[PDB]
Amino acid sequence: TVQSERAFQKQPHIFNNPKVKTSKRTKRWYKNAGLGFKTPKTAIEGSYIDKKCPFTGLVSIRGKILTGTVVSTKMHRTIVIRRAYLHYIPKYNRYEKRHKNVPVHVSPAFRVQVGDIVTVGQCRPISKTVRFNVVKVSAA
Template sequence: MAIGLDVTQPPEPENPEEYDYETCPFYGELPVRGQVIEGTVVSTDMERTVIVEREYDVNVPKYDRLMKRRSRIPAHVPEVLEPLSVDDEVKIAETRPLSKTKSHVVVEVTEGDA
């Protein structure tokens, strides 16, 4: 991987002839660059795509308080990663646009619900 993340290498693809190497950052040709974001999986309704939500605080100077905001980012899941479920903590990395809305890919599952 291009960024130099401390990510454990997932197992090799089971069927190398049918594997989609074009969208895999581990064994394929997908370059990873830019931001690395940690978040929680909130939706797994699409094929090979998850919605990752992250919360962050924004300062509101008028009230001298912090306000919580959240963003939802669609991310591609490579086939070599185990199937993800809702409430899994993941790291996603920025990459080239994979579709109209996806330009991030899951690079690590940090912890699960189990």
């Protein structure tokens, strides 16, 4: 269901030449994210279009990198992860448990299910509250 939606879905500034009869009808552009992150094979042979995918779209990865555990996958192309941590109250000389929910973007190159641990990287501000992007999935 690639052209199911209302405008056409293409990578920007790519060209498929009709005059030259090629084997594949869609030339696809991809980049590696850096930091020793392997590009998944489904990004390269895939047919999806996403601007906010870090392997097919116009989004770089830079800044903090974080790890979490996903709780919500219930909405379109964005999932919500959860980082539990310990906060240290100095008067009582002992820690407090705390957690923060950050909603991260996910490309359709990842099959992320609730309970798995992901690895997120900072990107440009994608939406009102989304500022992150999933670059690695670990099965659990």
